[PDB]
Amino acid sequence: ERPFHCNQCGASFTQKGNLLRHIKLHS
Amino acid sequence: STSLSCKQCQETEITTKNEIFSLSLSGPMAAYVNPHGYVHETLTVYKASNLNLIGRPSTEHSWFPGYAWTVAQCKICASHIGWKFTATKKDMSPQKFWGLTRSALLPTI
Ligand SMILES: Cn1ccc2c(CN3CCCC3)cc(-c3ccc4c(c3)CN([C@H]3CCC(=O)NC3=O)C4=O)nc21
Ligand SMILES: [Zn+2]
Ligand SMILES: [Zn+2]
């Protein structure tokens, strides 16, 4: 359901593209 | 007590210093290591506001045994603030608290 995980905080995403943006925003 | 706000947007009060408690031996705030080598100085508070949760509780690599975490983000700007912790059994006290990462909050604690 949410297979993509942020390695900094553990946030999970259904769309990998939203993971990529989320990681960027940790900066 | 001093209000703590999102460092990124500084639009919301997330918690106040009167919410701070020590859950274990390591004082109210200590450094913890996540599975990938990120170090979060995590402050434990009983109650927090103006946060949104992502997903469902997990016990994976929990820093506080007996609790599950859920990622918590600023409701305004979506910046990572910390995690809500929820007991996985009834004998835990408190049944829930928040672990806020120092680098996400202003003022600096
Ligand atoms: C990169 N990556 C790929 C999958 C994955 C998964 C999903 N797992 C499900 C079973 C096996 C994998 C989780 C994580 C992951 C990333 C960052 C954190 C965590 C977990 C847990 N966590 C805190 C939360 C607060 C705390 O107490 N301790 C912690 O360590 C993180 O900051 N990263 C993943
Ligand atoms: Zn993240
Ligand atoms: Zn914010």
What does this protein look like?
It is classed as immune system. Keywords: Protein Degrader, immune system. It forms a dimeric assembly. The entry is titled "Structure of CRBN:IKZF2:Compound 15". Chain A: Zinc finger protein Helios. The complex is a heterodimer of chains A (27) and B (109). Chain A is an alpha+beta fold and 27 residues long. Chain A has one domain (1-27): 2-Layer Sandwich (Double Stranded RNA Binding Domain). Chain A is 41% helix and 15% strand. In chain A, β1 and β2 (12-13) form a beta hairpin. Chain B is mainly β and 109 residues long. Chain B is 0% helix and 48% strand. Chain B has no helices and nine strands. Chain B has strands spanning 3-6, 13-16, 29-33, 39-45, 51-58, 67-74, 80-87, 96-101, 105-106. The A-B interface holds A 2, 7-12, 25-26 and B 34-36, 38, 54-55, 58, 60, 69, 71, 73, 78-80, 83.
Main traits of this protein?
heterodimer; A: 27 residues; alpha+beta; Double Stranded RNA Binding Domain; 41% helix; 15% strand; B: 109 residues; mainly beta; Metal Binding Protein, Guanine Nucleotide Exchange Factor, Chain A; 3-stranded antiparallel β-sheet; 0% helix; 48% strand; binds the ligand Cn1ccc2c(CN3CCCC3)cc(-c3ccc4c(c3)CN([C@H]3CCC(=O)NC3=O)C4=O)nc21; binds zinc ion; Zinc finger protein Helios (chain A); Protein cereblon (chain B)
